[PDB]
C-alpha cells in the first residue's frame, strides 16, 4: 500500500500503520461492556492557526490522537470509525475551485482515499448527514485529562451533533491504552527518529567550540534533522544548557532562550529530539565544552552512566517503574558518597530522600507521538507522594511494547542543596567543604530511548555516552 | 542603556527603541481630543501555550502590539503606560521560590526593571491594587479588527477590571498608526533582518542543486538565519516552490510542505524571511535550478525586473499605492506582448483586467513587527473591488517612514489562464501558440523591502536580483563581484 515519505534517505511509513491502530482500537472497544452496538468513534483533527490576531500562519502539526488514528497531515479534517465493522471515513474540507491560485492543486476525495487508505472520504460540510445515514446508537468522542499537562482533551464537535447521542467518557481511556503499546510499524518509526537525532547529536558534539552560543548548536541540530531526516518539527524545544544552565531543568524556553556563551571548562547538557511524521525522539548528551572531562566532571558523569546502565539492565516485563527510579537514586547516592560529597549510611540517606536533592525529576517517561506520551497514570495507578517519585510520569509496571526514556541525572541546584543543608536529617550526610567545589558545576543527564521486550529492553538510541566515546568524538577522531 | 543582543555578529537593539514607541504613543494620545486626562494604556502580553492537550510546550513568541510597546520576551506579562506622564509599569508573573528547582535563578522585579528600562515593575497578581492606587480616569485597552486576518485583537483583562472604566475603541487606531511609521531605531533592525535574510538567500542560491528536495533549502535558510543572525523564528513559513510549484502562491504549508525534488530546467521561487526580536523581513528570490536562465526564463524574469524597477523609481510620498499596482500590471502586459504571449492593444488588455491573470496578488504590503503589518486599511480607506487590486493589503498613499514590500510577479496559473481563454472579453489577447510553451513554466517573483523616505525610497534588501547577479551567485562568485 501507500507510504508517507519525504524522499532522499527518509523513512517510508506505511499508511497501514494507522489502519492497524484503528483496528486495535476497535478490538479494545468491542470488549468494553458499556460500548453499544452501532457505536461510531468521532475524532476531530487540528485546524490551521495564526499568531494572535495577525494573518501570520503557524506551521500546522496534527493533533496526536487524530494522527495516531489516521496519520492525516492536512488541517481541518474529521475522522470516524464504525466500531462494529472498523470502517473508516475521512472528512476533508471542501475547497472552492478558486483556491488553486494560492494553496495548490485541489485534490479530489478519491485522491485522499488513495493517499490514506481509508474506506471512504466525504466533505466536512456533509458530516452530520453522512453520520445520520449510518443510524448510530451513540457517537464516541474524546474527552479526558492529560496527566502531564492537566489539560482536557478537545472533544469533537460539528454542526448538527446535538441531534446525536454522544458519549465522551468511554473513548479516552481505551485509545490512550492503545497508544501505550507500540506496534512493530510504530517501533520502526521510533528507530528512525532515534537514528536521525543520534546522528544529529554526534554532529553537534563534533561542532561544539568554546565561544559559541548555545543556540548555534540548536540550529545545527534542527538543520541536520530536517535536511537529512525530513524532520520539519522537533519533539520539544531544544535544551542547550552550558555551565550553570546544565543544572536548569527547564532551560531553552523563551525565558531562557539558549543565549549563553559556552565557556572553557563548562559542562554542556544538550537535550534535543527530532520529530518525524508526529513521532518523537528524546535524547540528552552531556559532555565537557572543551572535549576533556576533568576529574570532577568524569566522576559525576560516570555516576549517571552507572545508574543509566543499571536501570536499562534491570528493565523487563513486571518491573515496577518507581523501583527503577529508586535504583537510580541509590546508585547516585553511592557514587556521590564515593566522591566525598556525601558521608554516612546510604540506607539512611535513602530514608531521608536525599537522592531527590540531586535528581528532582522523574527517571523517565512513556514516549510515542508525544514526547511525554499518554497513559502513564490510568485510573487505579496512583502517583507516589515523595520527593522525586512524585515527578514520575508513570507509576506503572513495565510491559512489552512500551517505549520509555531512561534519563537519570545529577545536578547541583542551589535551592535544593540549601534546603537540605538546613535540615538536620539531611545536612549530616553532606560534606560542605567538598560540595562547595561543585557549586555551579551544573549537571549531567544521560537519556536513552528504549522499548520493553519480552525479556528486557531494546536500545533505540545510538550516541556516544562513555567518556572515551565522547572525548574521541569531540577530538575529531574517526569511528 | 541596555540592549537586546544574541552575541557574535547579531544586532544590539537598544531597549530605548521601545521607550521611544511608548513616548510616541503617549504624544499621539495626548493630541487625541477624546482621550481623558489620567488615562492609562493597558496591554496584555502573550501567554505560554502547548500543543493541543499535551504538555509539549510551543516556543513563545510575543504578541506584536505588546512587543512594540515593551519588547518583553517573557510570557504571562502585562504592561501599562500612563498617558499624561508616560510612566511605564511592567507586570511580571509571581513565580514561587520552589520553581528554582526547574527554573534556576527566579529573577527579581528589579532585574526586569533594569532589563527593559521601564519605570516600575510589579507582580501580575497585584495589577488591580496597583492600578487602583494610581486612580486612573479610564483604562485604554486594545480592540480592533486586523484587516489581513479579519481577527479581533485580544483586549486586556484581569480579575478586578470591571471596577474600572474601560474604553476599548480609542487605542487600536492610534497604536496601529504609530506602528505604520517606523522610527530610526526600528529601521536599524529592519536593515539587519534584511541583511541576514539576504545573506541566507545567497547561501541557498549557492547551494541549490538539481535533485535536492525543496525543504533542504528551507532548512539551510533557517539554519543560517538562526546560527548566524540569531533569528530563532522566521517571519512566515518558507515558500520553497520549484517547477510548477513556483506558480503556487501560498506553497509550503502543511498540505504542500516543500517536498518536491528540484529538476533540471525548473524555475525556483524561494520566498523566505528571518525574524529578529519580533521584527520581520520578507524577500523572494527566483532563479533557475541549474544556474542558467533559458531564453524563456530570462524573458519572464526581466519582465518582472522591469516592473520592480519602475515601481521603485516611482515610489515617493504622495504616491497612491494602487497606482503602483496598476503600473506593474501595465508593464507586465506590455512585456508579455513583447514576448509574443499576448497580442493587441495593451490599453484594451488593462481595461479587461488581464494583468490579474498573471499577478493575482497585491503588489506589496506594509511590513514591520508582522510581515503583513497593521494599518493598511484604516477607517475611510476602501478596498478596491477589481481583480488583483482587491488583494492589495493597503490602499493608502505613501508617506515617509512607511516600510513596504515591492513584490511584482508573473505566474502561469492554469486555472486563471483557462478562465481568460473562456472569456470573450479576454481570450483574444492570448496567443496559445506561444502561451502553450509557458504552461507549467511556474512563476517569477522579485520581492524586496524598502523604506519610504522624504523624497523616494531606501533599499533594505541586498540579494542577487538581476539575471547576471543570479547566474554569478550560483556559480559561486563572491558577493563583491560586480557582473
Ligand atoms: Mn529529554
Ligand atoms: Mn525525556
Ligand atoms: Mn514574501
Ligand atoms: Mn510579501
Author numbering:
A (entry chain A): 6 to 484
B (entry chain B): 6 to 488
Q: What do the authors report?
A:
Prolidase Deficiency (PD) is an autosomal recessive rare disorder caused by loss or reduction of prolidase enzymatic activity due to variants in the PEPD gene. The PEPD gene encodes the enzyme peptidase D (EC 3.4.13.9), also known as prolidase, which is the only enzyme in humans capable of hydrolysis of dipeptides containing proline (Pro) or hydroxyproline (Hyp) on their C-terminus. We presented here two high-resolution crystal structures for the p.(Arg470His) variant of human prolidase.
In addition, comparison of structure of hProlArg470His to previously reported structure of hProl using Root Mean Square Deviation of Cα positions approach shows rather small structural differences mainly concentrated around poorly ordered C-termini. In hProl, Arg470 was located close to the active site and it formed hydrogen bond/ salt bridges with 3 residues: Thr289, Glu452 and Glu453. His470 forms interacted only with Thr289 and Glu453. When comparing hProlR470H structures to hProl slightly higher B-factors of the His atoms than for the Arg atoms can be observed. This effect is more pronounced in the substrate-free structure. Based on our analysis we can classify the hProlArg470His variant of human prolidase as “structurally silent” and assume that loss of function of this particular mutant can arise from flexibilization of the active site.
